[PDB]
Amino acid sequence: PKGTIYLTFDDGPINASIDVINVLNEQGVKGTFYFNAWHLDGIGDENEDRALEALKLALDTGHVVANHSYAHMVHNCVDEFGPTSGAECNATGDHQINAYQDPVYDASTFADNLVVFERYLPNINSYPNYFGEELARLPYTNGWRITKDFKADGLCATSDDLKPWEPGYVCDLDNPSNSVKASIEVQNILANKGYQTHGWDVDWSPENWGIPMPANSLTEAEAFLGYVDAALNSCAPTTINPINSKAHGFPCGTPLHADKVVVLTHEFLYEDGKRGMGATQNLPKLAKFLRIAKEAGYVFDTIDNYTPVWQVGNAYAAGDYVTHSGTVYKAVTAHIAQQDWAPSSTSSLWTNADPATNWTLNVSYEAGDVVTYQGLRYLVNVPHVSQADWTPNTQNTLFTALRSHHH
Numbered sequence: 454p455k456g457t458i459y460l461t462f463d464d465g466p467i468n469a470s471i472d473v474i475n476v477l478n479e480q481g482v483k484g485t486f487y488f489n490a491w492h493l494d495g496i497g498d499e500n501e502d503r504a505l506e507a508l509k510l511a512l513d514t515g516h517v518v519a520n521h522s523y524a525h526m527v528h529n530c531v532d533e534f535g536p537t538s539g540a541e542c543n544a545t546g547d548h549q550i551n552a553y554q555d556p557v558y559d560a561s562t563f564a565d566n567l568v569v570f571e572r573y574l575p576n577i578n579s580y581p582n583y584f585g586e587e588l589a590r591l592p593y594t595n596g597w598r599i600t601k602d603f604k605a606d607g608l609c610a611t612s613d614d615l616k617p618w619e620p621g622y623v624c625d626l627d628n629p630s631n632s633v634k635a636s637i638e639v640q641n642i643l644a645n646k647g648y649q650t651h652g653w654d655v656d657w658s659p660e661n662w663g664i665p666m667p668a669n670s671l672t673e674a675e676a677f678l679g680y681v682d683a684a685l686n687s688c689a690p691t692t693i694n695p696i697n698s699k700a701h702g703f704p705c706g707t708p709l710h711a712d713k714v715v716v717l718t719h720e721f722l723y724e725d726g727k728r729g730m731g732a733t734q735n736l737p738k739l740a741k742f743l744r745i746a747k748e749a750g751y752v753f754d755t756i757d758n759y760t761p762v763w764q765v766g767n768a769y770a771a772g773d774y775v776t777h778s779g780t781v782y783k784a785v786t787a788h789i790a791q792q793d794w795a796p797s798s799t800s801s802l803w804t805n806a807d808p809a810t811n812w813t814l815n816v817s818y819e820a821g822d823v824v825t826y827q828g829l830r831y832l833v834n835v836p837h838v839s840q841a842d843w844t845p846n847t848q849n850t851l852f853t854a855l856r857s858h859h860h
């Protein structure tokens with residue numbers, strides 16, 4: 454194969470998710486679904502009476518369910534969040550304005566999302582393809598938290614004033630909006646809870662979200678495969694338009710991203726309704742795209758395999774990344790994996806390479822890294838691999854507390 458496509462769908466579960474899933478299942482393709490549980494509660498202002506049926510269908514036919522927050526940060530679009538807020542915000546179109554405010558509360562709505570999933574589907578954690586606690590994507594934001602050395606933030610994704618498609622909109626990369634700054638902190642909070650977050654390379658979408666009837670203006674399947682081709686190994690998260698879709702700081706050429714294209718789309722574009730004739734026009738586009746992409750040599754996979762799962766018998770070069778029991782590790786030395794030598798907090802073959810910033814065991818720390826431990830921040834003074842006896846509060850040579858006189 455020439456590469457791997459990760460088809461990802463945002464903002465379900467809604468009635469239209471069932472039609473999208475039915476298209477995928479007809480060709481055996483598995484997608485990753487970034488869900489918002491407010492649709493299960495019936496307050497997300499979509500056709501969503503079949504939301505629970507859509508959630509069950511995704512899980513029952515092998516698609517990966519991931520965490521997109523409870524209500525897509527719409528509490529930040531209105532004065533008081535309630536059952537009608539999704540409709541109120543749809544009437545203004547103001548979703549991107551002040552979309553992130555208090556990052557601790559905003560991050561907490563990812564945790565709320567899981568509480569609601571597990572209420573509506575009590576056996577959801579018996580599904581191996583339920584990744585709600587481990588994989589996330591931030592509303593509006595092409596931001597990434599993959600490894601300790603693979604992060605990116607959408608520095609123009611959300612605004613304090615104008616929508617990014619309005620003519621007077623200005624983004625200053627050196628002084629981002631307060632909403633952007635808050636979304637960066639949200640990324641960091643999730644990473645410390647063990648999430649990875651994934652953005653996207655290409656977006657099957659209207660040119661910009663100010664276009665009326667945005668389901669009517671979707672790229673044809675053949676032209677869209679051309680966009681996927683152009684994104685392969687070209688650092689598309691940094692070059693994508695419009696400016697609010699860019700992932701600034703994305704590490705071009707990073708090995709984990711080689712030969713991969715993450716595709717974003719939204720199931721609500723595949724419905725005949727308020728956004729246009731999306732079912733009539735775009736479900737055939739999606740079906741055709743699956744066929745022509747496979748014919749061109751792409752394979753489809755889900756985001757849980759984007760960072761490959763550690764496997765007995767695999768061959769790892771020094772520096773290769775895996776996940777093991779949901780934690781990211783980096784190989785210390787080239788080796789062939791054996792069943793009794795899995796990655797761990799004490800393994801000599803691996804170090805923990807989670808994108809988290811709390812102090813953690815068995816991390817390869819570099820001078821200048823900042824860790825949090827027992828509620829205090831410390832600078833790493835000298836590179837080392839952390840271990841249980843070298844906690845920051847006990848090692849003045851390795852760490853300097855940001856409140857110490859040694860700083």
Ligand SMILES: CC(=O)N[C@H]1[C@H](O[C@H]2[C@H](O)[C@@H](N)[C@H](O)O[C@@H]2CO)O[C@H](CO)[C@@H](O)[C@@H]1O
Pocket residue numbers: 463464497525539543548549592593594662667
């Ligand atoms: C116009 C429209 O359909 N808006 C919906 C909104 O879409 C947002 C996407 O989720 C983001 N990925 C993108 O960056 O910005 C668009 C536009 O705001 O999503 C919300 C939540 O599902 C929905 O309520 C809006 O109708």
Ligand code: NA
Pocket residue numbers: 587647648649779780781
């Ligand atoms: Na994790």
Ligand SMILES: [Zn+2]
Pocket residue numbers: 463464521525592593
């Ligand atoms: Zn979304």
